[PDB]
């Protein structure tokens with residue numbers, strides 16, 4: 001096995017790298033890199049090494065690493081361009097792993113942890129670590145074990161040990177429900193005092209120094225804390241030991257925040273899972289609380305409990321510890337069905353960057369490219385700083401607030417990267433410039449066609465249609481690769497079927513599984529020798545096909561990500577290959593392509609229906625368009641259908657048959673008009689929506705930009721049993737709306753889209769009546785005290801006070817007769833409730849810690865003085881009104897003269 005690295009780091013004039021050797025052993029190296037740089041030489045040179053612009057370069061070998069840093073500084077000062085990879089780590093890696101990679105993973109020490117601390121006020125400061133760490137869970141990927149560090153004695157109450165068996169019991173058995181398979185994994189360890197707890201943990205670390213490091217919110221909390229705490233009581237001199245190279249760097253951040261430090265641990269690759277998820281989930285979420293995610297992601301949730309989180313140890317150490325183990329597991333479980341860490345491995349291993357650098361598109365891509373060129377003796381530019389310049393972005397049509405029964409949408413595949421490829425946009429393919437007319441004129445083909453030999457953008461640009469641009473040819477490769485791997489992933493799957501089937505008519509003695517590539521399909525030759533196999537040789541044979549199917553796809557996905565992040569790096573100033581023009585070129589082209597096809601579509605359609613100027617294109621956003629089908633349907637009469645579904649196929653066919661070919665054919669025009677290099681602008685149908693047929697429902701309706709809801713039957717061809725609801729921007733998600741109301745509005749909406757006014761009305765009446773009898777929490781509002789709590793503290797209020805913060809002060813004011821039981825409110829997430837007129841608390845609203853009940857000393861008073869109507873209105877009716885207005889509907893039946901009569 002050809003080795004591979006784990007981590008790299010530059011300290012002084014040397015590279016420090018933990019890597020696995022030939023026979024899988026974690027070793028440490030200190031190499032004094034002799035980095036080489038470049039400078040432009042006069043034409044009359046015997047050289048290879050030419051930049052992306054052709055100009056010749058000569059190599060400059062440095063001997064000593066900081067010499068090169070000096071050198072660079074120098075050239076710049078003079079005015080001379082200094083070329084090459086200014087980042088040496090990356091230089092090293094290419095230079096040392098000059099081959100495709102092949103990494104293991106079972107040989108990579110991913111440590112996953114979560115620490116816990118107790119505090120009167122729910123949150124301690126990672127910055128100063130005043131409070132003792134009381135619990136630490138550390139799952140080790142290599143050992144596949146959970147190490148638990150438990151603090152028996154604390155000034156916040158000493159406690160009893162913990163029971164593995166009680167942890168095992170069911171909910172009703174006063175048990176914690178920790179899953180069996182995990183139970184014999186746990187390695188509990190209790191401790192008297194903190195000094196020992198830490199001490200030991202420290203030793204555990206140096207003994208099993210981690211490579212990747214995860215957790216949930218580990219980076220912003222867990223890590224900074226562990227770090228400081230130890231520093232505080234044992235001195236930084238020793239805290240540094242967390243670095244396998246004992247080098248460390250603190251760094252402060254800001255915002256409303258201010259002193260939010262982050263410690264970079266030299267030697268290890270922190271990869272907070274909250275980010276890891278944020279970036280690759282492909283699913284936009286409203287909150288990132290570990291509960292909510294593990295709930296949607298895995299259905300289960302978080303260990304439920306009584307009382308505030310600052311009490312749980314003091315009030316139920318058994319569960320306190322149990323919950324830690326649960327948490328760490330959650331993540332483990334998520335990474336299993338999502339493979340995020342692995343993916344990270346793959347990605348970084350491809351590009352040859354520090355793993356964490358995965359988070360940065362800039363670093364990632366810069367590397368790739370550098371490598372590509374590197375093997376063709378070309379030289380990369382040099383990072384030039386540029387000013388931030390507010391260029392145009394995606395196009396979003398302003399919709400007409402109304403109801404739209406039948407609707408269907410289409411998607412531009414990949415867009416930005418496709419555009420790049422179509423126009424052949426590159427820093428070194430820039431041909432010229434041209435007199436540019438108002439964009440509007442271009443999307444109408446009114447403006448006169450620019451260059452007769454250049455690929456252009458509507459902003460005035462023109463690029464050569466000859467030389468293949470560094471960037472487009474680069475993307476292309478990746479885009480080819482995904483096609484390649486998606487291919488494999490699919491082969492080992494349908495090949496996986498072949499094995500699963502021949503296992504029912506198993507065994508024909510004692511044999512050997514075979515040397516077969518699993519990436520491609522089988523061949524009758526091997527399809528036969530297979531029937532002849534045993535349940536021992538097969539099965540094992542299956543594992544191999546099952547594992548290559550996982551690999552192939554984990555690689556395929558990798559590509560998908562690259563492609564998406566690319567525009568984001570071009571649009572970024574630190575990008576070595578940045579250029580505002582290229583940037584504005586892309587975005588404006590997109591901007592046009594859309595409204596151009598918008599025109600084309602309306603054009604085509606109202607001609608096919610024999611109508612005039614009717615605009616079907618209802619809305620558009622970035623890469624998608626939403627057409628109105630209302631007309632088409634009425635044309636062939638609603639009654640001519642005998643089945644909700646029956647229509648869907650019709651629209652579907654119409655799309656793929658009439659529409660799509662028209663679209664592409666009308667898109668070709670544009671390609672010639674701008675006279676680009678290839679066609680690449682493809683759009684395919686995707687959603688199809690409308691009310692159930694017979695149902696007096698409305699299908700969909702829009703409130704405004706990015707604010708709409710639709711009843712969907714078909715999506716990208718795959719049909720639905722029950723209609724699904726694509727809700728967008730309409731606050732059924734906004735974490736601020738009461739959990740009760742969120743389900744309530746969702747229903748109203750469904751009742752609108754599928755049933756119609758009549759249905760909606762009766763519901764409104766129901767939840768309205770029952771509203772009063774519900775649990776307060778579910779109907780309370782939620783916001784976060786952005787700690788601007790300071791900004792006011794006149795002990796009392798003081799103008800410009802947001803309603804939010806208004807209630808907080810009135811809480812703390814009345815909290816005065818504390819008893820310690822009232823959990824102090826500290827700069828983070830709250831509840832808030834109305835409060836009728838003349839209430840004895842003063843002010844006219846209260847708020848308290850999220851996820852906590854309210855201290856009985858006042859709780860009942862509060863409830864008594866709740867302003868239900870005010871509540872109802874601001875939280876439920878107002879957002880509701882918004883919807884009804886747009887859809888021309890009424891949620892309250894007005895006077896029918898037939899009232900007063902008894903039918």
Ligand SMILES: Nc1nc2c(ncn2[C@@H]2O[C@H](COP(=O)(O)O)[C@@H](O)[C@H]2O)c(=O)[nH]1
Nearest residue numbers: 036084085091095373374375377378379380
């Ligand atoms: N081709 C190329 N090599 C670079 C660049 N910056 C640094 N290098 C160094 O050039 C040397 C290798 O060239 P090769 O061995 O492939 O002919 C290595 O020391 C490599 O790290 C760059 O922009 N292009």
